[PDB]
Amino acid sequence: QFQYTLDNLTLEQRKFYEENGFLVIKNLVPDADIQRFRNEFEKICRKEVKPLGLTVMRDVTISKSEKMITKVQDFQEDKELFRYCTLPEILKYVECFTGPNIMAMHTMLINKPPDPLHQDLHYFPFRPSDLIVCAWTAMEHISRNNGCLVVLPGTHKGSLKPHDYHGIQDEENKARVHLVMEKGDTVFFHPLLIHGSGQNKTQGFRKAISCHFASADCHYIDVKGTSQENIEKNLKDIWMFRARLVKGERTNL
Numbered sequence: 001q002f003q004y005t006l007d008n009l010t011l012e013q014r015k016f017y018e019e020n021g022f023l024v025i026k027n028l029v030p031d032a033d034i035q036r037f038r039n040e041f042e043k044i045c046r047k048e049v050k051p052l053g054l055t056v057m058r059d060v061t062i063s064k065s066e067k068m069i070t071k072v073q074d075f076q077e078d079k080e081l082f083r084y085c086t087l088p089e090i091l092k093y094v095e096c097f098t099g100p101n102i103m104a105m106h107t108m109l110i111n112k113p114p115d116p117l118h119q120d121l122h123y124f125p126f127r128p129s130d131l132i133v134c135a136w137t138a139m140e141h142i143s144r145n146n147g148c149l150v151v152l153p154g155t156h157k158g159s160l161k162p163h164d165y166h167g168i169q170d171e172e173n174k175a176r177v178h179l180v181m182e183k184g185d186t187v188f189f190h191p192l193l194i195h196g197s198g199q200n201k202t203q204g205f206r207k208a209i210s211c212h213f214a215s216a217d218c219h220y221i222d223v224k225g226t227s228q229e230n231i232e233k234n235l236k237d238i239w240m241f242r243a244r245l246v247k248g249e250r251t252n253l
């Protein structure tokens with residue numbers, strides 16, 4: 001052998017990960033913990049809690065204007081949200097991809113409003129991609145109606161494609177899968193897996209929380225002269241300042 005998983009937790013659901021580049025573990029995060037994430041998000045939403053280095057996207061406004069939160073990133077200095085990263089149920093599985101030295105590298109809570117494909121790695125200037133994993137958990141029932149994740153199975157085996165931005169303007173040849181998930185369900189997936197969110201044709205805001213983890217043994221690459229040049233918009237340091245040791249030891253990242 002396997003390239004995308006290590007030994008052990010897991011069966012020929014390794015064989016699945018290896019052919020597909022994603023794996024869904026049912027009812028992984030307790031209802032209790034999901035509600036705690038919900039609660040903290042809404043406090044942020046009421047400007048009652050103001051975490052330290054947190055980024056807020058308000059990409060939608062509403063009138064009867066006033067802007068609504070649609071994503072928060074870099075919540076590593078917020079305690080209830082950061083428990084997601086430290087949660088032993090999440091880590092018993094993360095280790096299968098990263099190994100025993102684990103860094104929580106990118107944190108998001110996504111609040112998709114009522115209504116494009118990409119590779120998360122476009123944004124990550126660190127390697128090997130095989131020792132990096134996104135852990136993405138449904139904070140409510142997510143189906144095709146409210147914009148669940150779409151994935152192109154097996155594209156984790158292919159190259160890093162160029163992006164404009166949320167970006168790939170092409171390379172398919174395996175039928176898409178819509179990841180309908182229940183509350184607490186978690187999907188694990190590779191940074192080169194081509195994916196996107198479908199339309200949210202409901203009137204509700206659709207919540208998921210997620211983290212990309214990477215082996216501490218990984219390293220930082222220079223993106224000048226590559227497809228990734230654009231992300232710079234030094235970079236090693238912003239990602240170093242953001243990275244948090246979540247298990248084992250901080251070796252190299």
Ligand SMILES: O=C(O)CCC(=O)C(=O)O
Nearest residue numbers: 110112120195196197208
């Ligand atoms: O809409 C989502 O839940 C995930 C968004 C996404 O794919 C990303 O930020 O990379």
Ligand SMILES: [Fe+2]
Nearest residue numbers: 118119120195
């Ligand atoms: Fe993504």
